[PDB]
Amino acid sequence: AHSFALPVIIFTTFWGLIGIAGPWFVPKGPNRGVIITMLVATAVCCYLFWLIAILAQLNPLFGPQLKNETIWYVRFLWE
Amino acid sequence: AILLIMEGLSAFLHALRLHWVEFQNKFYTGTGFKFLPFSFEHIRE
């Protein structure tokens, strides 16, 4: 088993840190606007689908099934 | 020769269509005149 808080917290912190800090440290070049927009948009949409993916698995409604042989093998492989 | 070209191209063109109708049509007017610039850069041509 695993705790659901810590992945969400670390990913919130990391992606927010990127999306917020990035635009303020880039140099004032001819292409500052485009790099700022691409970084901001990567951060938002990227953390967004990852959020979707992770909170999909949360709270399963039905468990998977395994074959008998696959079962007997994982009985001795791990956990 | 199958996955990396055929399926890749299909998905690529699908995304292109996606941003040609479902993204572009919302705001982008579609009416305009491309600027032709003059230069003697065509002497390389």
């Binding site: 001795f76 492989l77 791990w78 956990e79 | -």
Partner: protein, 211 residues
Amino acid sequence: QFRVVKEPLGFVKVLQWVFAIFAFATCGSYTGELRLSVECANKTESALNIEVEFEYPFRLHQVYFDAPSCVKGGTTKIFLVGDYSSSAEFFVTVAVFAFLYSMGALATYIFLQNKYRENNKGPMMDFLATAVFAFMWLVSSSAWAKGLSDVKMATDPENIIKEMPMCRQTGNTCKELRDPVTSGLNTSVVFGFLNLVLWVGNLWFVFKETG
């Protein structure tokens, strides 16, 4: 030149290399065995000899024995609990890569003295690598200590006696015969701690060497 060998730098580096190689060489192949026995009301069904083998990386979740169920001459599978291979694999792979780095530094001191004193570029990167190595060794040592404490918790015979349901029933007095030995693990973590302290001292020495 022999002045480099007589210099405390190479002497300390070789000493740390020897301690580290001995340390993870003994760490990566530790073995042991613990014994017990179960007896029920029917003495024809009692098993007086129950041997369980444990070996590195101490996947207690994987280690097993099939002890008798003591109902109608049956048997059941009792599996130990605890995952220690995480911190253990971390520590040994850390030690192996650190040992590769140690022989690289020793080779630089032996054959590439000229490139080492060249512009004083090599020493600074070597020192920074040593500092990162010291911090991550401290992390690995703390994890290894916590994990071996957890293993010592998991070696309690009373626990493994308790989980197996039929010991809870009448007439089922399971006794541990030979307890596991954890002295080798204590010695190995002691060697790791000495490795840490020695590399901190060598870190200070290399720092003043840079100047």
